[PDB]
Amino acid sequence: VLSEGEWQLVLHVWAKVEADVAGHGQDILIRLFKSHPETLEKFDRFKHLKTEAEMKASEDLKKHGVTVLTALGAILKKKGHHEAELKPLAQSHATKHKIPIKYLEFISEAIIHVLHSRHPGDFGADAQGAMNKALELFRKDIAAKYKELGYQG
Numbered sequence: 063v064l065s066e067g068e069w070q071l072v073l074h075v076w077a078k079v080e081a082d083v084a085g086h087g088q089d090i091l092i093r094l095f096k097s098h099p100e101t102l103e104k105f106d107r108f109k110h111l112k113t114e115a116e117m118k119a120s121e122d123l124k125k126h127g128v129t130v131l132t133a134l135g136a137i138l139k140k141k142g143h144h145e146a147e148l149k150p151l152a153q154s155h156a157t158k159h160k161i162p163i164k165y166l167e168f169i170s171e172a173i174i175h176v177l178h179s180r181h182p183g184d185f186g187a188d189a190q191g192a193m194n195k196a197l198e199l200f201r202k203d204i205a206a207k208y209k210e211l212g213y214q215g
């Protein structure tokens with residue numbers, strides 16, 4: 063469980079992410095696709111994008127980035143009490159999109175990488191540690207739902 067002080071570090075930097083949701087969303091998805099190409103193959107809607115320039119130019123990719131970060135933000139602001147938000151997400155990602163938990167670890171790494179690039183002064187070691195913990199909590203709760211449904215993996 064994150065302490066109140068750790069949640070404050072997470073939300074203080076998230077308020078900055080919200081100043082440019084679309085720019086952030088885009089950098090995250092691109093970092094994910096370049097670092098872990100197998101992840102792009104899960105998106106029939108983005109599979110045709112081959113280069114980073116092509117990814118940067120896609121307005122549809124930018125729109126999905128806002129969708130991803132908006133959902134994540136609603137979860138983070140619940141400070142661990144995210145049962146109602148997390149459930150629909152685990153169900154669709156496990157049963158409809160077939161996303162293994164490992165890919166959720168990959169996007170977590172991408173989020174941390176981007177926050178670090180864009181907000182050095184608001185993202186020192188202490189904030190990076192709190193953010194990692196918040197993302198691990200998210201994965202842990204989703205992994206439990208996956209197990210229930212028969213998808214742990």
Ligand code: COH
Pocket residue numbers: 101102104105106107129130131133134150151154155159161165166169
């Ligand atoms: C490697 C693939 C991958 C990852 C790691 C991932 C991780 C995450 C993530 C973790 C931080 C968040 C908050 C979301 C949030 C969402 N994802 Co995904 N998703 C993934 C693949 C998908 C796919 C595929 C879709 C459907 C896209 C489409 O066709 O519109 C998707 C749809 C969504 C939607 C639309 C509604 C729904 O279908 O659930 C939201 C919200 N998500 N996703």
